């Protein structure tokens, strides 16, 4: 698994792969791990599948349950603690192979300036979070191979559109090195799936497009 | 890592992908995991990858030692019983992680009828072996898909080039189902390698035929 | 143990072998694997026994108990839920010997396509859970087996009649590999059970259609 | 594994199946199990299978040497204490996971009265020997079985034909109810292997034979 | 131990050996083993005798409980899953040393067909049942071999009493190979117990007639060992 | 097992029973456990077959080596040492799992009063050894209750037959309490053995003697 | 990480590093340790991060907390003992890997000469308080190299500047000794953080400064 | 430590970093990792430290000492072979805290082709080694990223110059993100080494040049 | 224990403290640390005191041994290789609780320029040697204290006295902070031993040179403990 989250001017893209293990199985080839938790938000999370996937479902329902009690959404902050609390809790279950951990994008709708609002919010086992500054970051067992990509071709991200083909070649990397990370599969049409959040909300990105830049991706290094 | 063997009409072919794995992580996109030992025989070899290396070095180094020494070839019995005390030597390093497991194929020159010459012998880790008479094995992370996969395939091959197409589509269904095993890389132009032994001795095959095969194989499923 | 299930268009069909184990020794050979959950959905279960059928009976009481309570059937991602549930609490007790995983299937009335409304849904140990989209799956000690049979075997399921052929074939291709699984026994007229599910309703299938199929694989093999 | 030794007058029949596993997976479906040793005996041997194929051969080597370099064959009781010093030597291996248990059966050339020259000798894992005076005994997974049936069906043998079907139908038996000992395959048509030993040497037998006694075995329990 | 079950037309047999035992050492020649559980079911329990004891005195009173607090009797698929839950419940302790296993015979009167409404269930460990369709089940230490000598023997239960001779024969045959049974004991007159249950109830086999039988058993075994070799 | 030996005036009687069992199975129903080790001396071993059969060959072997190599045999006294120096040699192995324990008797020819010749040695786990001086004595997991009967037996003892007779008796009881040690079988004709040693020598005492023995015991509990 | 503080004349000041780790890889590169916990008080926390950041924000809602509460803030000794008591109870998790250590920094304003009421406290695993005497102290990793670099250069801290330049000198002394401790980042522009506290309260350092003064060392040291 | 080695037209370059470590201290800042093996050859070697010099020592003096005995330099292989059987030797060790890993260097003379004569040979822990294709490797704790900043930076090497400016780029990449690895120090004027080799032989790179290159590469990141 | 060494113009200068400890309990006041190994070479060693003394003793031998055997000394490299040949076949009794650390300091009489033909190599657990850069280094429970003391006193070291004096300083900042090393001890008399060495050779540092530097700081650092707060 490979998750990546990169922030560019006025938003944030968050992309991740498709593919599940069971040891050297390949046991699933299209899990979607990146979640749209509310209208500025977006969540993904690698590790153990069964956890991760109840920890987007009940942290979505967290987030609205406030909103519809309060009448008005969690601020940024109060998001980030959330998620923190969630994964501390769950830190005995991981020290017995239940670990999970999350990676947080989001556009701040209280930040006072726009084209910065992006967030990149990155966590440890223990609940640890971290917000990023660099502008991108990744996690899961492709994450560094990730990282060191992006570190190299960040300085492209000049919108939401190089950034999610930026995204899509960092995830390409991630899997060309871990085996546990699925690269785009052009016989199946399986591609990555991504979330893009800038002033106007969180949207799925076109399955269309991705495959677009994964095509462009793969003939470019051929 | 996934090697395969299999009986035609006057012949055998073994074939073997390229990847070499630290854990999730790729270590090797050309490794090469099939060898001619001697005019009429090939060997395979999986699993830990210094000892796979040495294995065939040494193999190949004892079978040529007996004949310039005796003047004439080990029998074919004679090989596979080499073979299988070199893999019982290795027994208590193989409990401590260096395990490796070898698969042998050769055209036996004496054998009484030469459609029928074709030998396959597997091992396990105490140097058991077994000639296998249903016409194809497999060794490695990848062998049990491989084999339920010639399983159904099997009934096409009729000669050389139907059964190296074949065994290519098994090493193809092995790496679609096993991360530790290779499928043929389009873009770096790298796929598997094999051999075809038959009455006139033991060739590689050429890059160019594998890689057409393994187009179609592609074009195919898509 | 083996459990298969597939998706045909307009449908699904789950089938499951009969064996039971203590070790080596075979401790039964009629054991009904695969339960007509509710009108419209399909339970099959490996594993443990006794969790096992405790799992399928529990989960038809919960289901119906929904339904009476509340007037309505719960939606599928609800049965889906629930089920995932119920794993994710056996896990203590099943990293203590009493795992139990269960496969299941459905005909989904809500969705707007009723030739795609069949529904298969594979669980891990810890409860996640997954729609399976390339139309089979299986769960056991000889799911590999079975699931490389119907990779191979899939392409010629174009209705109920045709799944149900490839996946009586898939129980007797993993009961010819693990001997976990019980194969046809001709001789005390014994066959793997399964169970049809359209927009009907679930419906099991006959027995004699089943041994039909059986001999006839049977003889084919031959 | 089963492997099955009686007495008839005049002779002794030794048979075994031909399954080999590796856990729950089938791994070999033809292992031949029982050799003859010299002329006048024959060996069947249990356990791991490596270690099983060294013993036997090595035993052959041995009682063969000593024939050639003292110009006469070993006493039947100079055999029993060659083979289980074998067993003895191998004790601490055995513990490890390398147990091999041995079945010998023969005609004894030297014995006072002929239609009482047969012979049948059992060994446990210290090597220790016993020399069966019941009339059969059997080693290996599937063992208990198979000596509860010939204990039944002990009185029925009155020649080597009714011998060798009581074996048959023993090896049946011990696969009814063991998954590890294979039954008859006649889609494949392996059927157990079996030795003959009488006054004029030990033969095998025909394969041909077998099938029919297996299939009227089938036909009756059918 | 040995308890073996099996069908015949119009009913079921159970029967028990009597051997209590504590490492290689005879503690016990008299133990019962077999229960009337209510009027139309018998169980058999094998393993720890403190816990076997235990069971089939608990179950039965349940099973009496139910019938007196909602004045008819349990159904036979409700008695199974009592039984079931009381062998679960036990798990833990059977793994520190305390396992019982019981054997469960019954006569539905609410089966459909009347020479069917036999009944046998056994248990595994973890409480996992299963109604056996082949006529016989045995459990304990000498059930395997109870079992193989029943199905070379099952074709020659035609009633009552060659089901209940079958069974002393299988019973036989699981000493013969398990010194953790107890064959029949001629010197001391005791010899295995059993339970017949038809549509007429559960009743309790008289001794009389399971000491002849024994005693023929033991007298063919004699000639026919003569007669071989 | 049990094995037991008391003196009677003018000799020794040791007699020992047939059983050999593995865990709670019995394994073994006609092993003979008493052997003449020379011609004055008898031995009889309990515990691991295997061990227990090679003591007695290899003890018998010694004692004859010695005397063919100096012309004498061996005085008592050297008997005992050698075979306590063979039980101690066997500790380490006996330690884990490989444990053997003999009981000797014999008859003196050097011995001051004839009467009284007769000896009866037993030994311990570490090859201590004690001349018996109560008369009787007994090994194996039936030995306490074989001794306490004898103690009530004894003083009925005035010659070899009525030794012949507590002894078969003793090892009677033994049955009786100790599942391990097998009783007369009847149906089978097999009965303990025996062995009677006095001034002329050790002689095998005939089967029909002690049925007669045991028959006769039985009656009277009856 | 390292955390110095140091008294001045008429105040404190504390600063920290930047670093994050993760064994040996950089995970963070301006994560901020040092918080101003109310307005005459700052804490500053080494060890595993997601606790430190805990314990922080949850000290100065405790204290926050007894002010609204009681109308008065907490004296310095209640802080300090309520911080101790924090430590305290993390003491079992602390002994799993999650253990930090804190470092308070204070002016007292109702100490009785205001030129001595600065104070710096720290606290041991268990709780254990010590108000330093001595002018200076450190916490983290690289704790024992700043507090001798200190020693060496605290004479020369006349006022809040020097004690700014010294704290700054000692942060980068720790830096070039201890791998886990990041020293000024002039590529990003990444400095160390800081508190300085005096009279008139708890004010945050201008990064400007910092970055001054750790030039004018890093020229000093060329 | 990270050390690097890449492939340009005609030649080699390896480099490495200058760091030292003991847990988290750093305890050497000028230690050269890379040596001139012999004329045409450089090691660089990784892990323990005491392990690692000792290798590159005794590798030299064995290559020297062939040349010396037979007259005529190892070919490149029995180079390969003699590096990997004094790993593969130094196994135990390795598993027990000694871990050392080696990364060669080298311009082969009898190569076909001069241009790509070059040659870069990387090798596992169990002596396991792969002559790289791809034009570049790294070993050491920084080597995953050193390798994701050669993947992006290699299309820039065309020459020795350029070659050498991407490996020392490669390091500097390393060490900003593993804090085992020393970046450039320019307090104290220490940089990478290196060592380029071409058909002249190979030659250190002087300090000069590679601190030109590394304040260029800070410059640029600045 | 803590034992240091620095370059000076033309020699170099190791001192070493008297402290012997058994857990808490000082059990030594009076050890001698350092040793004058040739005629060009010192060795001081900590860790496990019979270990340490005899590697000294040892390694001297060894490098006698070789000068009568080949009429001439070992090269320095070579004295290094021996050290640390030394050093790492004591690596498994070194797991085991016998560990021992040396610290070497020489004059190289064949380097080519003789102020800075000074040398020191210090050595890890598994005999991993570096040939100092930096002018000083420290091995020992207190070396951490004495390092970054010298750190920040190098800059004085012009010569052979200055040298010894930010010797016996860091020594006394070590025992200032590492209760495992042993301070100036006045009522006794007890101060730090060290060996020069320089083009004339190893030689050791008088008593009362020592003594007076030792008081010297001491007076020091009260002045300046008074001076601040």
């Not at 967030?119 to 991108?136: M, P, Q, T």
């Amino acid at each position: 698994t490979t998750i990546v989250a990169l922030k560019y001017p006025g938003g944030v893209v968050m992309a991740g792969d498709r593919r599940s293990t069971q040891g050297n199985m390949i046991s699933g080839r299209d899990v979607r791990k990146v979640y749209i938790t509310d209208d500025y938000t977006a969540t993904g999370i690698a590790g153990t599948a069964a956890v991760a996937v109840e920890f987007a479902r009940l942290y979505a329902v967290e987030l609205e349950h406030y909103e519809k009690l309060e009448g008005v959404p969690l601020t940024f902050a109060g998001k980030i603690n959330r998620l923190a609390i969630m994964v501390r809790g769950n830190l005995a279950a991981a020290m017995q192979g239940l670990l999970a951990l999350p990676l947080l994008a989001g556009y701040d709708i209280h930040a006072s300036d726009p084209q910065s609002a992006g967030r990149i919010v990155s966590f440890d086992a223990a609940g640890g979070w971290n917000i990023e500054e660099e502008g991108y970051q990744a996690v899961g067992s492709g994450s560094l191979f990730a990282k060191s990509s992006m570190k190299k071709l960040y300085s492209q991200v000049t919108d939401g559109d190089s950034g999610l083909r930026v995204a899509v070649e960092a995830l390409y990397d991630a899997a060309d090195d871990d085996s546990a990370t699925g690269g785009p599969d052009l016989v199946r049409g399986i591609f990555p799936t991504a979330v893009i959040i800038d002033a106007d909300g969180a949207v799925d990105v076109p399955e269309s497009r991705i495959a677009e830049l994964a095509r462009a991706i793969i003939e470019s290094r051929s």
